[PDB]
Design a protein around this ligand. Structure first.
Ligand SMILES: Nc1ncnc2c1ncn2[C@@H]1O[C@H](COP(=O)(O)OP(=O)(O)O)[C@@H](O)[C@H]1O
Ligand SMILES: [Zn+2]
Ligand SMILES: [Zn+2]
Lengths: 585, 408, 229
């Protein structure tokens, strides 16, 4: 109709009045011509610019996409096809026939929704949905335009097709298969090389648990993606997706089918996918030179816990971490540090773990699929692996609660994670190796509930010694009551009846830019302390092995990172030795 | 004829006055300003305003409630035009409620009032409310507002019309399961369940375990020779005498109230004063508090009787189950985690999977009595740990995960 | 609706005939067709390197030439039938229903393409993940590891019948021959299994190797169908 052409010309005027779009289109065209990889035929439209250009057209796109978006697509495709002559001898007949797709950015107005807030009132509108990608379907190509040759007539033919998903407006569907005869009735010669196909995939978006109330099942909605968006995401991705929420089929309206339970099927036609200072650095570097900066940073950690300075120091050093190395023989050296907590259950382990999980930027909570060696199947039957916490926490930290309750399979899997920082997957038809370079912090509790302070955790918790030896530091806490100190710490609870934003930047910068190496200063200290510990036959929390020396080196490197020094010094080794002696007592 | 009914509704909305104010007109105007297309009509005002339309509604509401919807929509649109979608009818009433067990084949299509506890709720479903259709043979278009598509064109062959999706409107609907209070169920009987349906603004207002008061229409639908499944069109959900208040205040004013109540707990048993007072404290229960971080302090008091056999320990629980207004009694041996706690089960009436509450979910806001607690399985105990300490139940079954609260 | 394309099958078929007649090893493919006519060989293999060499020879001689290799690569489904048609008329009931020989194309070699200053994108050993929808109907070379092979299965191309009323052989319940169409009485058809065109068929699946998989992904697979010799 004439309105379609009017809106096509209106979108052409929009494109011309802001040359910042069609100049990017020209740059894409030039880049594609130079490569005779190809950039996609997609541009992003600012919703505010469209609002300030034509309020009616922008409101139509938001509220009545079926009558406004296809004109805009036609206008953009015409502008792209008319801006150059396409002098390609053969590519002009195939590659130039792909329509151009639109994307939107800016303020969405009231169309900022979640899979729970998304309701039937929002149907037939362009809306933006925030959620998590639970799973993705299998990718298949889809026929768009068929080209064929009529040998008997000596000239070619073509045919187009429509589908309820790709067509925003309800055009007449075309269920016809690839034609064998044309209007002239002569048998057709198939031209696959000049036919057009577009890939397609379906994904499911579910509301984030961060806002989900209890007592109800989670809300999910399906999104359709095509062409360049077909394989851009993976399951478990936080995503902000803009698309047209559209219904399909019929809810028993045909024949009688008067069942009350039957409802109409709905989904979203996705078109845009958004997967989810120097002053501070200089202040960090200046603060690093103060003698008390380490203690200040330790006291900033865990403000809800009184005392436990050594545990806070260990947490800070573990966050700082060591330095990995590579050798000419192909060997690799572990740098990260692990911490284990033991003692009575409710005593301060939960609070410290909560602080660590909330403070760290890449902290993942675990408790008794962490092995990342299990497959999840799609609706069509095919299956894909799902990521595990030990693998996702690469270059991060793992927080474990009720570590004693984990299974033996988890233990035998985490042995390699803690030792070689890798995971060796060996299953029926699936074999792969994944990096697991993650720091581990865990809490465990005795069976009796009350820790026997006279004995090691090897009898209080009875975990395997090989598993325990993979933790660089161990701490035991138990509520040994001193009435005045308990009163002082519990007055804050009774009242209920360095800033963290800067500290996180401090840790980030220190781990990002500082890579300390060893120095002759620490060599003699390490050798002497290790020899003394070996010579010390008195009872200790754990025997002295080379893993203790590795822990000493890692702690020295972490302390150097706290000092942001690229070369270790004697003070780092002394602090590491003092901390290790404290942990062993 | 129905124009008189519409005019009467228009008067009852615009011109009815109570407390020297146009309460209905003002509340509808406030809803329009809030943009809530629903009107809460009180039946007690309707009976006092006009008895004939009340008789018609009570006897044959089948045409009255379409008239209600259209009249309210028209009046609200007039009010919006004066100040600057189909409005939903909501009914509030206080008349006597018929017992669920007394529902029969005589109350068909009659508006009734009920009370009970919600045990299961379904997911939302989208239902059509306004359609525009086109003939595939000749592209003739028309609009349609159980509904079925026309068999012949108005201008084409049988069933020529197809639905224009981008020019139609749809609404939400939810399916609910109601059952009578187990405290009102004599022993030897399973409480009767009842299917209820709500749409638009009445959806998602309740969760399993919620005790509600219902105003709705008793009706049946086809899903046994001729066993047609009954279902309720929800119209309104709500969830002591002055002399009783004075009597209980005097009871509170009694200088020996605590000892009187202590003796009142199982007077047919001797001694055991300490456990009697502890059970009294359990019956009253603690006070809820909320941390500034959003966590809730469990106010329930949980007591373990751990004495020698034959010390009236079972009799105390059996007496509390009589006394507590909300009480559930079950043996440890005859129960399971899927039965004590919530579970996901498929509803055969609507052919959909439903989240269904358990025994402890039913005891929300009350007391549960359990015996032979040492004889239940450890998984059940693990679930009971969550129920006791977090007042929540975590469900991970089939391919769905959810968390449901239980203040038991 | 009618459209126009620069492809001309008349020139391509004439070039195919000229290449068959002229390309020396006598001509190689003429010798192959002589061996087939001698009933020594069951299948014919077409080498795209020979076609490219002939095209380059025509280019250096200054004669007319069209990129026949690219045309075959783009629409191999029809060019296989074109080569079969050329052989059926140049080798020393509808013919296609009675043919029992097979034809296949072998890919270009990278050294040959680089030697003739051309890019052989189709023969590049790409993985199954990199095959987009644009390659549908195109002759491509895939590098991978086979993970599943099915045993030989029957695959009838044309089902044969015989009619008692007329005795004609019918190829695809009621006889469609001219004699029975003209006559009021029709002989019921029965499946002549021994006359049906059986073809040897196996189902094969190829999968990406470990070094081809992206980070954290699963190696994808593709279905390979093998027919004939
Ligand atoms: N102080 C008491 N006064 C009256 N009856 C008592 C008392 N103590 C026990 N009984 C009797 O004991 C019985 C309850 O025993 P019960 O607690 O059920 O046994 P068990 O502890 O094995 O469950 C009742 O019949 C009750 O009459
Ligand atoms: Zn018609
Ligand atoms: Zn015959």
């Amino acid at each position: 109709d004439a309105v379609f052409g009017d809106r096509v010309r209106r979108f052409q005027e929009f494109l011309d009045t802001f040359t910042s779009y069609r100049d990017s289109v020209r740059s894409i065209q030039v880049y594609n011509s130079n490569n005779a990889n190809i950039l996609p035929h997609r541009i992003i439209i600012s919703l505010d610019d469209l609002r300030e250009f034509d309020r009616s057209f922008w409101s139509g796109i938001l509220v009545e996409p079926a009558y406004f978006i296809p004109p805009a697509e036609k206008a953009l495709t015409d502008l792209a096809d008319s801006m150059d002559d396409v002098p390609h001898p053969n590519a002009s007949a195939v590659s130039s026939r792909h329509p151009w797709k639109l994307s939107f950015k800016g303020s969405f107005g009231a169309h900022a929704l979640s899979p729970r807030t998304l309701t039937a009132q929002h149907l037939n509108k362009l809306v933006s949905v925030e959620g998590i990608v639970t799973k993705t379907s299998l990718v298949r190509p889809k026929l768009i335009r068929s080209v064929h040759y009529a040998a008997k007539t000596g000239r070619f033919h073509y045919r187009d097709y429509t589908d309820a998903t790709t067509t925003l407006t309800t055009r007449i569907p075309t269920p016809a298969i690839y034609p064998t005869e044309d209007t002239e009735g002569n048998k057709l010669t198939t031209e696959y090389g000049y036919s057009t196909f577009i890939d397609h995939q379906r994904i499911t978006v579910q509301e984030m648990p961060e806002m989900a109330p209890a007592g109800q099942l989670p809300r999910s909605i399906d999104v359709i993606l095509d062409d360049d968006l077909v394989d851009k995401t993976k399951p478990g991705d936080r995503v902000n997706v803009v698309g047209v929420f559209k219904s399909l089929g019929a809810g028993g309206m045909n024949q009688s089918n008067s069942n009350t339970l039957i409802g109409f099927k709905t989904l979203i036609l996705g078109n845009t996918v958004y997967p989810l200072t120097d002053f501070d650095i200089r202040n960090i570097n200046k603060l690093s030179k103060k003698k008390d900066i380490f203690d200040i940073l330790s006291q900033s950690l865990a403000p809800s816990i009184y005392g436990h300075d050594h545990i806070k120091k260990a947490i800070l050093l573990m966050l700082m971490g060591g330095v990995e190395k590579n050798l000419e023989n192909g060997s690799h050296l572990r740098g990260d540090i692990n911490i284990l907590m033991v003692g009575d259950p409710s005593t301060a382990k939960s609070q410290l773990l909560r602080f660590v999980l909330n403070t760290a930027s890449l902290a993942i909570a675990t408790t008794g699929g962490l092995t990342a060696a299990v497959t999840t199947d799609r609706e069509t039957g095919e299956r894909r692996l799902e990521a595990g916490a030990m693998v996702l926490a690469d270059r991060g930290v793992v927080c474990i609660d009720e570590f004693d309750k984990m299974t033996d399979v988890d233990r035998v899997a985490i042995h390699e994670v803690m030792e070689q920082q890798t995971v060796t997957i060996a299953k029926a038809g699936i074999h792969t190796t994944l990096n697991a370079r993650c720091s581990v912090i865990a809490a465990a509790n005795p069976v009796f509930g009350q820790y026997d302070v006279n004995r090691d955790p090897h009898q209080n918790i009875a975990l395997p010694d090989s598993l325990l030896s993979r933790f660089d530091l161990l701490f035991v806490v138990t509520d040994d009551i001193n009435e005045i100190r308990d009163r002082s710490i519990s007055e804050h609870v009774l009242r209920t009846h360095v800033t963290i934003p800067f500290l996180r930047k401090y840790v980030q910068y220190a781990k990002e830019r500082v890579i300390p190496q060893l120095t002759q200063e620490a060599i003699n200290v390490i050798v002497k302390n290790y020899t003394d510990l070996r010579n010390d036959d008195n009872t200790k929390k754990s025997p002295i092995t080379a893993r203790t020396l590795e822990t000493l080196i890692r702690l020295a490197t972490a302390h150097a990172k706290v000092r942001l020094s690229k070369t270790v010094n004697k003070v780092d080794a002394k602090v590491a030795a003092n901390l290790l002696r404290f942990a062993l007592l | 004829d129905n124009t008189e009914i519409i005019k009467s509704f228009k008067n009852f909305i615009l011109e009815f006055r109570l407390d020297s104010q146009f309460i209905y007109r003002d509340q509808l105007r406030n809803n329009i300003l809030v943009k809530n297309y629903s009107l809460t009509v009180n039946m007690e005002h309707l009976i006092g305003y006009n008895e004939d339309i009340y008789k018609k509604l009570s006897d044959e509401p089948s045409d009255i409630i379409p008239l209600f919807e259209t009249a309210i929509t028209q009046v609200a649109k007039r009010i919006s035009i004066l100040s600057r979608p189909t409005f939903q009818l909501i009914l509030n009433s206080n008349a006597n409620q018929i017992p669920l067990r007394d529902l029969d084949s005589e109350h068909v299509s009659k508006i009734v009032r009920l009370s009970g506890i919600i045990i299961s709720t379904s997911v939302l479903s989208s239902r059509a409310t306004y359609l525009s259709i086109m003939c595939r043979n000749c592209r003739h278009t028309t609009s349609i507002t159980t509904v079925s598509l026309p068999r012949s064109c108005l201008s084409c062959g049988p069933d020529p019309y197809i639905i224009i999706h981008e020019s139609s409107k749809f609404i939400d609907q939810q399916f609910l399961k109601l059952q009578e209070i187990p405290e009102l169920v004599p022993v030897g009987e399973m409480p009767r369940n009842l299917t209820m349906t709500c749409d638009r603004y009445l959806t998602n207002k309740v969760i399993p375990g919620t005790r509600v008061t219902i105003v709705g229409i008793y009706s049946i639908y086809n899903s046994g020779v001729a066993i047609r499944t009954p279902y309720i069109k929800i119209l309104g959900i709500q969830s002591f005498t002055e002399e009783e208040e004075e009597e209980f205040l005097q009871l509170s004013r009694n200088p020996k109230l605590y000892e009187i109540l202590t003796n009142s707990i199982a007077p047919s048993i001797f001694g055991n004063e300490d456990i009697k007072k502890a059970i009294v404290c359990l019956l009253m229960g603690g006070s809820k508090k909320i941390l500034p971080d959003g966590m809730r302090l469990r106010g329930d008091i949980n007591v373990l009787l751990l004495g020698d056999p034959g010390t009236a320990k079972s009799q105390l629980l059996k007496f509390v189950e009589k006394v507590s207004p909300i009480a559930v009694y079950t043996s440890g041996k005859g129960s399971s985690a899927a039965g004590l706690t919530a579970s996901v089960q498929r509803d055969p009436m609507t052919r959909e999977f439903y989240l269904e509450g358990g025994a402890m979910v039913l005891a929300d806001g009350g007391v549960v009595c359990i015996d032979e607690f040492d004889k239940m399985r450890d998984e059940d105990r693990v679930a009971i740990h969550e129920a006791m300490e977090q007042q929540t139940i975590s469900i991970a079954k089939a391919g769905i995960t959810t968390v449901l609260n239980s203040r038991t | 609706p009618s459209i126009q394309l620069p492809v001309d099958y008349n020139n391509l078929f004439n070039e195919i005939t000229d290449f068959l007649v002229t390309f020396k090893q006598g001509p190689k493919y003429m010798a192959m067709l002589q061996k087939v006519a001698n009933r020594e060989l069951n299948s014919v293999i077409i080498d795209l390197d020979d076609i490219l060499q002939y095209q380059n020879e025509k280019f250096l001689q200054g004669t007319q030439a069209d990129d026949l290799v690219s045309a075959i690569q783009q629409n191999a489904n029809h060019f296989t039938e074109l080569f079969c048609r050329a052989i059926d008329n140049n080798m020393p009931f509808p013919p296609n229903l009675t043919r029992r020989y097979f034809l296949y194309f072998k890919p270009l070699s990278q050294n040959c393409a680089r030697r003739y200053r051309k890019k052989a994108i189709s023969s590049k050993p790409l993985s199954v993940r990199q095959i987009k929808g644009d390659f549908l109907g195109q002759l491509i070379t895939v590098r991978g590891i086979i993970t599943r092979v099915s045993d030989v299965k029957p695959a009838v191309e044309v089902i044969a019948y015989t009619c008692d009323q007329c005795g004609y052989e019918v190829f695809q319940s009621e006889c469609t021959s001219e004699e029975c169409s003209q006559n009021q009485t029709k002989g019921q058809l029965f499946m002549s299994t021994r006359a049906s065109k059986f073809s040897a068929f196996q189902e094969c699946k190829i999968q990406e190797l470990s070094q081809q998989v992206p980070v954290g992904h699963i190696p994808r697979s593709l279905n390979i169908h093998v027919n004939g010799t």
